[PDB]
Design a protein around this nucleic acid. Structure first.
Lengths: 127, 151, 206, 98, 96, 112
RNA sequence: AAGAACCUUACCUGGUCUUGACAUCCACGGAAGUUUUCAGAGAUGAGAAUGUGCCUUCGGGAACCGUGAGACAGGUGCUGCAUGGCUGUCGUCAGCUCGUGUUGUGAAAUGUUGGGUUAAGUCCCGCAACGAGCGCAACCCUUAUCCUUUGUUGCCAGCGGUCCGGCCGGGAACUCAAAGGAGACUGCCAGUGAUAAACUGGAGGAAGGUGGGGAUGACGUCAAGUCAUCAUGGCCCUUACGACCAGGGCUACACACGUGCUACAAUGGCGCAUACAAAGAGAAGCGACCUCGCGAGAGCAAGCGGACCUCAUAAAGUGCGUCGUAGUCCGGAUUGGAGUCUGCAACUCGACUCCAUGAAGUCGGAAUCGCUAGUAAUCGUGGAUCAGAAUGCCACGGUGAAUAC
């Protein structure tokens, strides 16, 4: 069986497809440790799992494309939240109420002619 | 800066403690968008302050925050050419933020080799109102007590 | 100068191109220069035709050259008395075996190019400018034209003071993307300097 | 077999050009995997709008390039032979790989 | 718009292919490290100007060397002059 | 009138609400100020004012153009602009309403 | 200027010529392989044709030159103050006006001024005003939500063959790959509101109050750049105010200024089991087999106008320890010793490796400027020359800081 989840966030999408099994997470056929996961956002991946019960409900295979690390974590969270709603909307009410399904559209703004960056113009010329 | 509103914004906390106060401390301790090393030094400082204080880490943190706490200030307006300021009780959120930034600047006032060691030592000796930022708190208090002559 | 080119933005929305073909970018330049040369050739040899424009279509080792001219008096001739000669000379100068096809256009006064060139002609023919634009606008409006606009700037009737004049009548939603617009600029050669003309037309909103 | 590729810059023109050929082969063919979107080219060409200093004043020009594929698997040779000599795409070239 | 300039450019590009692609080939044949001797150094009768690499390939509309464009072989101002007249398929105003 | 006839046949809602909002909210707003003049197509033969001083605009246009006047005057108005006078009071709204009813009745009878 | 030794080019040095540099009805011919000869920095020179495309009396020439003569200028001078095309200024500023009618002997106001208001002449109420354009609004892309056609030169859950051959039967729950439809319009309620417009919440915030970004820049002020881009207005240089061949100027340099880049360390030079980037260029081009180079790279180098064949390896980090305080293992601005592709060769002069080279600087005169959410900053990629390298310029994916009483 499968749970429907795509998880679009910050140019990152993760195919969260959960099957019965252990709560362990396999990322790129590998675990989080030898994936060298003590980098940034080292604990945020279990925050969505911190409040909900683990038991024997979640075993998923995940691939993540795009972004850095916060992009990866956001993709994981959005995909698992999208896969989570199989248990009716009773969970989704509090999932939204706690901001667990937060999707932010704060993408990059295009570079502008005349400004060397997003909002920085040349230092104002002499009076 | 005259038409906008205030939405009481909030950003990512540390999941271990899960406190908005500690969230704001760690998020203002951030520099140039640095997450791993900044949080590592934060936890190093927290564990070292717990070790040196001996009491519970969170209550020692609260005692330190109470120690650094200032009370009142004024704002410069330049009305009559002399110091003509109405002492306004600063906003509790703004008071908290100013205390945060005074602690951070007191930490910043050194140039020590190791950031973790310097941070731990200074915050630990500032936890019992005998470190670095309490002098700034006393100086701010001295800035008061005299601005009430003009109201 | 601040106003944007009118049909420039229009072309990418609703107005068809002046040519539609494909070639690799290096010989694209040669094709463009051949188009320029055939444009000059056609506008010089057919100076009496007063063609509205010429559209170039390039199939494989061929070209169509559709022509929209106001009057067919010399465009077709006496059942192919001169059209084949023009076809031959065009094929020879362009170096490719070419055919020529003919279409006709209604209401010559509704053409911006024709009215602008006509106005330049009377201004070459020692008449007052005022009557020129007034006659042009009144003739164009009465033919069902919903809105037009003319502009003349430079020397007005021999006066040496700076002159800039415009005149409009009818709807001109110029800053509306879905407005059909016809634009042109022509030139005159009066003895005291060149006289520049400009004109805008509007026909439909959708 | 014998796939057909088109390289055009007009979405409606390429859509009609690929919606004619597919039934041209489907007059007596069968199967066909189906239409595929295919990726597109993108190029932002910038040029100084002013002829005199003031580099800040520029403008952006781009050219599209769409591609369409059909991927017929098992057609009959009659219609694929009849494909040639019936070319009607004017100003746009078709690409076929042997 | 110097017509002597344009004559020089036209004649050099005319001689940029008839006098090239064979002298350079001969050099490359004799440019091998295996013994190259004084023949390559004594075969310098070439003006070294007709070679396309050392040839500007100027714009051929109004003779403005600035803004040489490989895609169109024109200058910026005339690209604006002609493209806005249409007649160049596929070119639409860009935005994103 | 052409706009309302087109609107009973035109597009209901398209993109911003402004283009269709300006179409219908102004209908009855200016329709009340227009009333039924669409049926008039001419020049009036008479006029009426409830207070001559306050609404002297109509009488001024009338005597500029030459329309006879049948107005009601009272103690605070300016009756120099009216020659065919009906003395009365501006407070008696019921009386003037019945007056309008009676004059409408005698007009609708007339000689017909 | 998206660009310099050579052309560019117009400045200099070494040396000569105007029907001209190069285009004509051309006046007669070889019918434009230019062969060998060497001198000479060089438009310096000049010398035999061995080939003979057109033909229906080579009954016309040569489209090139051989002769000085019926295509004509090579312009680097004014004039933007006569100007047409062209761009910047105020300025995404919220205004500029017009037709009917009135007050006023008349120049003119009247509509565009009063209150509520909104990003705004965006609205509403009242009044001798009613209406209408030029503008903002909207008509286009892109992304944030969901849909049907959609699977290859395939991204895989699946049964198994797997060394992790998606090859089978492949499928939708796949981001992805392009055509089209919905989504939001202040819906409907409650409040503040004159019952007007607006301002506060709720099933929506996967998007709520123009969703966020781009193009769209009204009459006009600037005698501004453009007769050197361009057609001339009144004119002009005239053995040409040109033709040329090589070496040289914008890379340099005893002046004040500005923009940009690594610096002031213990997060920088350290090595190791060492992870995820969207998104382009690619045929006077991209070049997977092996080998070594303190190196620029050196040669066999396959496949290719494309999901085929080059840069996905991303740095952002776990721990070993250091300069554990200073000119410091920080900081690497110099002159000569061997090379990578250079045109013919690198000499104000191609840029890159190995050293002798780490001077001044321990966060900064009285300060200004840019910046109210993926934003200021901190890391890493494509394009223009491409005989050749980018501190920059035109576009990208990462980690992300509040002060707006």
């Amino acid at each position: 069986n499968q749970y429907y989840g795509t998880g679009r966030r910050k140019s990152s999408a993760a195919r969260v497809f959960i099957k019965p099994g252990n709560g362990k997470i396999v990322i790129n056929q590998r675990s989080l440790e030898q994936y060298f996961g003590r980098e940034t956002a080292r604990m945020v991946v279990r925050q969505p799992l911190e409040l909900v019960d683990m038991v024997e409900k979640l075993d998923l295979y995940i691939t993540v494309k795009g972004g850095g690390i916060s992009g990866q974590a956001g993709a994981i969270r959005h995909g698992i939240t999208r896969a989570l709603m199989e248990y009716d909307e009773s969970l989704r009410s509090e999932l939204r109420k706690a901001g667990f399904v937060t999707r932010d559209a704060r993408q990059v703004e295009r570079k502008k002619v005349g400004l060397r960056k997003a909002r920085r113009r040349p230092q104002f010329s002499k009076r | 800066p005259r038409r906008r509103v205030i939405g009481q914004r909030k950003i990512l906390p540390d999941p271990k403690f899960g406190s908005e106060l500690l969230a704001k401390f760690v998020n203002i301790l951030m520099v140039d968008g640095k997450k791993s090393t900044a949080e590592s030094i934060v936890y190093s400082a927290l564990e070292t302050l717990a070790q040196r204080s001996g009491k519970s880490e969170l209550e020692a943190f609260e005692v330190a925050l109470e120690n650094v706490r200032p009370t009142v200030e004024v704002k410069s307006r330049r009305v009559g050419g002399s110091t003509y300021q109405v002492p306004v009780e600063v906003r509790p959120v703004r008071r908290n933020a100013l205390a945060m930034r005074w602690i951070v600047e007191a930490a910043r006032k050194r140039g020590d080799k190791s950031m973790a060691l310097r941070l731990a030592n200074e915050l630990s000796d500032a936890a019992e109102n005998k470190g670095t930022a309490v002098k700034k708190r006393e100086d701010v208090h001295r800035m008061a007590e005299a601005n009430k002559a003009f109201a | 100068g601040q106003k944007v080119h009118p049909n420039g933005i229009r072309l990418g929305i609703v107005k068809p191109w002046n040519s539609t073909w494909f070639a690799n970018t290096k010989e694209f330049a040669d094709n463009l220069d051949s188009d320029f040369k055939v444009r000059q050739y056609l506008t010089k040899e057919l100076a009496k035709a007063s063609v509205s424009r010429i559209v170039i279509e390039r199939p494989a080792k061929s070209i169509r050259v559709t022509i929209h001219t106001a009057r067919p008096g010399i465009v077709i001739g006496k059942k192919g008395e001169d059209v084949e000669k023009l076809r031959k000379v065009v094929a020879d100068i362009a170096g490719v075996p070419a055919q020529i096809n003919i279409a006709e256009v209604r209401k010559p006064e509704l053409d911006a190019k024709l009215v602008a060139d006509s106005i330049t002609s009377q201004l070459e023919r020692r008449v007052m400018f005022r009557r020129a634009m007034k006659r042009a606008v009144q003739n164009a409006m009465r033919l069902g034209a919903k809105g037009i606009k003319v502009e003349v700037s430079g020397r007005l009737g021999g006066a040496e003071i700076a002159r800039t004049e415009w005149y409009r009548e009818g709807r001109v939603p110029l800053h509306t993307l879905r407005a059909d617009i016809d634009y042109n600029t022509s030139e005159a050669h009066t003895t005291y300097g060149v006289i520049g003309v400009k004109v805008w037309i509007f026909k439909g909103e959708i | 077999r014998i796939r057909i590729r088109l390289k055009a810059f007009d979405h409606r023109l390429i859509d009609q050009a690929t919606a004619e050929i597919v039934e041209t082969a489907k007059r007596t063919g069968a199967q066909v995997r189906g239409p595929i979107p295919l990726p597109t080219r993108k190029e932002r060409f910038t040029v100084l709008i002013s002829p005199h200093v003031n580099k800040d004043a520029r403008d952006q020009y781009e050219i599209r390039t769409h591609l369409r594929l059909v991927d017929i698997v098992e057609p009959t040779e009659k219609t694929v032979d009849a494909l040639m000599r019936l070319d009607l795409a004017a100003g746009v070239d078709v690409q076929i790989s042997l | 718009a110097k017509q002597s300039m344009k004559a020089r450019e036209v004649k050099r590009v005319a001689l940029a292919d008839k006098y090239f692609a064979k002298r350079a080939e001969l050099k490359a044949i004799i440019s091998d490290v295996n013994a190259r001797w004084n023949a390559v150094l004594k075969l310098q009768t070439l003006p070294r100007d007709s070679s396309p690499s050392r040839q500007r390939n100027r714009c051929r509309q109004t003779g403005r060397p600035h803004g040489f464009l490989r895609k169109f072989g024109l200058s910026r101002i005339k690209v604006r002059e002609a493209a806005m007249r249409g007649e160049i398929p596929g070119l639409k105003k860009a935005s994103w | 009138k052409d706009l309302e006839t087109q609107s009973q046949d035109g597009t209901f809602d398209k993109l911003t609400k402004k283009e269709a909002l300006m179409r219908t909210r102004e209908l009855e707003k200016l329709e009340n100020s227009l009333g039924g003049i669409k049926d008039m197509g001419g020049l009036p033969d008479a006029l009426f004012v409830i207070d001559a001083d306050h609404e002297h605009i109509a009488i001024k246009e009338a005597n500029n153009l030459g329309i006879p006047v049948f107005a009601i005057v009272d103690t605070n108005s300016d009756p120099d602009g009216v020659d065919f006078v009906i003395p009365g009071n501006d407070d008696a709204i019921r009386a003037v309403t019945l007056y309008l009813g009676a004059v409408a009745a005698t007009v609708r009878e007339g000689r017909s």
